[model samples]
Target: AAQTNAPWGLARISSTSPGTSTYYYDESAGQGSCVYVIDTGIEASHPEFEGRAQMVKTYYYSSRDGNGHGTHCAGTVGSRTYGVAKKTQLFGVKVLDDNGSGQYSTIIAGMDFVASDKNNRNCPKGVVASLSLGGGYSSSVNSAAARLQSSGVMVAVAAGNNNADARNYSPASEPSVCTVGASDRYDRRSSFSNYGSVLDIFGPGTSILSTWIGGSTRSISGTSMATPHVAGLAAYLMTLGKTTAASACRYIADTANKGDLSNIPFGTVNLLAYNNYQA
Candidate 1:
């Protein structure tokens, strides 16, 4: 369907070129999908979620969004107005503190919880994880994320906003999950978006508008914002029977808009995720 008031990230992914007023996506998609937002937590009361957002496992302060980061990511992943998968359920897996930071162990704990939550899933679209947070390289964190993917959850992660090679990052560098970089309104690599061989695809990230804390909305930029777009797409694929991480990951890469992005690093593939769920 056509949503004229859609965000740039949503509009950008739904079309091939640019400057499209209509964001074409399947309103019927993601009807039973569940996206686990592993971040600072989400404001479950936000009307954008339509009671589809809830708290699953809180490894930090609380499941309610305090730092604003988690809510924004959740909005991009599956909010009614800003999400790519408009009908998917969002579970706030709070791993970060209100300061927008968390340790590797906390992140690992969130991952573990999601993996075992498989038996408790309420959605037929199956489970997917959106990891928009990451720091320096850590073997333990990377392994945990990989294990989550191995547990049949599609994982999408940010390629860091540090504007460096993603190979030096942990989960971004991990080969198991979908590693996302940032692109701007013009389809150019965002100035601060990390790139290189570890990157799997690009998504709109610059000045992205989404749901924030306290019943507010705001525009922000980062590979963090880019991640949930792909996560949303992964959830949509899961709705289409692409339930496993291996199958969904390959489908995302194969169907991406190849070499359409500018300023991508030499070693990275110039792929921008193309959300053809409407097809």
Candidate 2:
């Protein structure tokens, strides 16, 4: 990932929702929602994550990125109290290792297990699957996302941080999943965020301040960080009792304000564009 300019503090980029606290009158909702991240190892013990995240499963693919990409991605999605959806539950799947690389087969297998969760039938609350890591837009969408969507899972992805849009990356590029692009604090598309016809939605991806491994805090950038906005948005839609995977995606599209299209394509999606939109 490009490491030149960094991000802002978590408080700056966090979601506007009051979270479960708004629904239940609790500052923290012990755990009202759940999101399973199929990536490298998660720092499950981090403080920012206290009672919010639980380890449901883990898998190892390339075993690379000891540099902590998976951990970073986890932090952005659900690192205790530091991320967008703090009260949401988390499941970790370590398909790509510490080296930041993995095979398609491993990712596909991990996703199969996620789709098989028996809780899906009983709970009716569809799961929001976050894939914060991926190549550029041209890369093919992982088969896993398509299957997950069919199985009542809302898939969220990073459109890419390439600074230009040749094509969006897989999963994000896929029609079944909701691909997220990075917008700045001012709501302007990040200089580096890739954009194209496939871009589904925009989120806070640039100069974000969030949790890092070992209980430290850091500023990071990339469409990867911004995607949790959609993941959290999916969870928000679920709380509304619209449990179908596609329902959540469509709700998000329909709720998006129509004004943000100045720099984006006004496709069939229901986009919510606020007058103050910055990125």
Candidate 3:
């Protein structure tokens, strides 16, 4: 079997089981796609980015990233080593503070900016927005995300780490957003990932290794990490005919490995994200 040197989460999506350390995919995948990370911001200088990461419309005076969550999340989406889509361009749309916190207004502003920026060439093959944070259900936040989805950006949102029903969280609970939960390398639901009907699919979340601040790499776990894997899957799908947000979500749901996870709560969707790789 073909093999690669990479993290388990990177390999888990494209494989049917956690039996290989190999991640197999088309070298030409995600060539012209762009993924916007709306978080604390990304450290664009990381080697994993290979200069493909760029910060755009900073939320403050250059405070690109201090909390390391955005950089880690961005890496899972497009870093050369741990990414789902190696060639997809990474855009850092800072909406949260360096401490990984943001007000609903700030998040809404970033969502609006993405809607406008996407009209201009953010539409190469497709555009995806990775929202790896969440709060209690908020109509305003859900509305902003819905508007962004209407503009054609696939908003991959994280179900909170609370292990509660994801429908209790904003944006993740939003009808227009593609809600993602978390699973582990062993195809089991993560102990802390939120669940319920609002969740579209589960992506690798436990012990995820990805790019970090200060040109380093770290391994951590959260629904935050899982969202990027699903976001990158959306990027990978652009070349296939699922170019729009709604279409991509449907395609991912239809194509995902169904009812394949173990230790899942009684009635969660039980679908896991897959790269749809053919090799």
For lDDT, the strongest prediction is 1
* Candidate 2 runs further than 4 Å off: 1-30, 61-66, 118-124, 136-141, 166-168, 261-279
Q: What is the C-alpha RMSD of each candidate to the true structure, in Å?
A: 1.3, 6.6, 1.5
Query: Model 2 residue 137 lDDT?
Result: 33
lDDT of 1 at 66: 83
Report model 3's TM-score to 2 decimal places: 0.96
Tens digits of lDDT, candidate 1, 127-173: 88999988899989899989999988988999998999998898899
Whole-model lDDT per candidate: 0.87, 0.60, 0.87
Best by TM-score: 1
- Relative to the unseen true structure, what is the C-alpha lDDT of residue 121 in candidate 2, on a scale of 0 to 100? 27
lDDT of 3: 0.87
Off by more than 4 A, model 3: 1-3
For model 2, residues 1-279, the per-residue Cα lDDT tens digits are 111222332333232321112111122321355677767656666687775555555565332324455566666665644454556676776777666666776777777878896264233444778888776433334667788888877888877777655254666677778777776665567777777777767776767666666667777788877776567656645654644567766666665644442345444232431111122
**Candidate 1 clashing pairs?**
none
- Better candidate number, 1 or 2, judged by TM-score: 1
